[PDB]
Amino acid sequence: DQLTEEQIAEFKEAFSLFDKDGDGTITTKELGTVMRSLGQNPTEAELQDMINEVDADGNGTIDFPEFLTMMARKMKDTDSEEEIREAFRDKDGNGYISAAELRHVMTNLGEKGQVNYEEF
């Protein structure tokens, strides 16, 4: 559905956390901060499917492919590594990619440190 499962898990968590009445729907005046906790910070996200007047999780999810299939991941990816590079332009500290953080299956290299993107 243009979204894999580690994303709808975070989206369903964030939707559930910000629907404070257990409705199944969130008000328009709250998804701004839901947006902010997920990464996207727009100014006017309107013209949505207003059939329910707020949005379901069904409406909430399908709105996001309208937003993340439009987010060019390369810019989201360099600052991702500008963040871990203290000096400008490593391989062992990157080994912490998951040795402490997350998913730790069959890592690779390119060492000789790393320099830039490689999408493939």
Partner 1 sequence: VKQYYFARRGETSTHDTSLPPPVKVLSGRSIPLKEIPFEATRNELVQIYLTSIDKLIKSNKLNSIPSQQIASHYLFLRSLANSETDGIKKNQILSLAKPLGTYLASKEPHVWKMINELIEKSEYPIIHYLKNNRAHSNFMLALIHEYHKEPLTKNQSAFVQKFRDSSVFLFPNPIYTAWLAHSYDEDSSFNPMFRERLSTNFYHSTLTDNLLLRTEPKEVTLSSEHHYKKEKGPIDSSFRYQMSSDRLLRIQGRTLLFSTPQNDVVAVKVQKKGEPKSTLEEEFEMADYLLKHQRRLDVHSKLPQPLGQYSVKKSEILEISRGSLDTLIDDSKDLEVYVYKAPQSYFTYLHDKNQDLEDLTASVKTNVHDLFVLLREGIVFPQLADIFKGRYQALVQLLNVLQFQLGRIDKWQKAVEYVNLRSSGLADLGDSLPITSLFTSSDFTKHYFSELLTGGYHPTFFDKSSGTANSLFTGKRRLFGNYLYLNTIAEYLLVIQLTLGSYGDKVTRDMMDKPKKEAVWRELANVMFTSCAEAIHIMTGIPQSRALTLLKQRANIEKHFRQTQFWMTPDYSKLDEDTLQMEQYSIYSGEPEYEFTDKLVSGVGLSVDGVHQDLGGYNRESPLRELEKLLYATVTLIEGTMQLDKEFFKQLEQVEKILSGEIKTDANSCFEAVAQLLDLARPGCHFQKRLVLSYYEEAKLKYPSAPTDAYDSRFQVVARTNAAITIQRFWREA
Binding site for Ca ion (CB under 5 A): 21, 23, 25
Q: Per the structure block, which two tokens stand in for 51? A: 């059939």
96 labeled binding residue: yes
Taking the complex as a whole, the smallest distance from the CB of residue 59 to Ca ion amounts, in Å, to: 13
Q: How far is CA 18 from CA 39, 87, 94, 101, 103, in A?
A: 15, 38, 34, 26, 27
Residue whose tokens read 């729907």? 25
Q: Which among 9, 96, 119, 118 has a CA at the least distance from the CA of 61?
A: 9
* Whether the Cβ atoms of residue 25 and residue 60 lie closer than 8 Å to each other: no
Residue 69 to residue 90: CA distance in whole angstroms? 30
Asked if 115 touches partner 1 (CB under 8 A), the answer is: no
Residues 53-92 that bind partner 1 (CB under 8 A): 56-59, 73, 76-77, 79-81, 83-84
Residue 103, binding choice from Ca ion, partner 1, none, Cβ under 5 to 8 Å by partner class: partner 1
Residue type, 94: N
Taking the complex as a whole, the smallest distance from the CB of residue 69 to partner 1 amounts, in Å, to: 13
First to last CA, the chain: 22
Binding residues for Ca(2+): 19, 21, 23, 25, 30, 55, 57, 59, 61, 66, 90, 92, 94, 96, 101, 114, 119
Q: Which residues bind partner 1 (CB under 8 A)?
A: 6-7, 9-10, 12-17, 20-25, 33, 36-39, 41, 51-52, 56-59, 73, 76-77, 79-81, 83-84, 96-98, 101-103, 105, 119-120
